[PDB]
Design a protein around this nucleic acid. Structure first.
Ligand SMILES: CC[C@H]1OC(=O)[C@@H](C)C(=O)[C@H](C)[C@@H](O[C@@H]2O[C@H](C)C[C@H](N(C)C)[C@H]2O)[C@](C)(OC)C[C@@H](C)C(=O)[C@H](C)[C@H]2N(CCCCn3cnc(-c4cccnc4)c3)C(=O)O[C@]12C
Length: 50
RNA sequence: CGAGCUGGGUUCAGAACGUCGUGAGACAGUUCGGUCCCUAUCCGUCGCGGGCGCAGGAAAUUUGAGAGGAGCUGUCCUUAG
């Protein structure tokens, strides 16, 4: 039972670190995609919607 | 300056790559293809007429108020090594 609970805790801790990493990558893209708008090509809301 | 024109780019539907997302999809990217409608009423422009005016009716030649246009400049020689 200690092996079962240790495997399931290792799985949810690994999954938590994975989703926090893939959430941080999207944040570091949303900061760029908000700051690098308003420069050229399309007004400023076609790029703010992204 | 698209009721003047083009539509190559970008931001419609197809599709693909890189990348993200479990996912439908998305871009923090790139790539190929993609319907540019309208018989001009008025003003406004460019032209041409028709009426009347101008104290008679006519034919010609006109002054010019005013207005538009034009208004650019190279090189070579001489002066003179
Ligand atoms: C043929 C010209 C067409 O114009 C355009 O489509 C296009 C050239 C334009 O630019 C036009 C002016 C557009 O306006 C623009 O709209 C934009 C959204 C906005 C723009 N401004 C507002 C900024 C505005 O200018 C708009 C919205 O049209 C979509 C006008 C709107 C009233 C229409 O939809 C309109 C009724 C179109 N239509 C709908 C069917 C279209 C499918 N179809 C295509 N071919 C056939 C077909 C062929 C052969 C036989 N039968 C059918 C059928 C037609 O049948 O004819 C149209 C008038």
């Amino acid at each position: 039972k200690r092996l079962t609970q240790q495997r399931e805790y290792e799985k949810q801790q690994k999954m938590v670190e994975r989703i926090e990493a893939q959430m941080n990558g999207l944040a570091s893209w949303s900061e760029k995609a908000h700051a690098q708008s308003t420069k050229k090509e399309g007004f400023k809301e076609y790029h703010r919607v992204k």
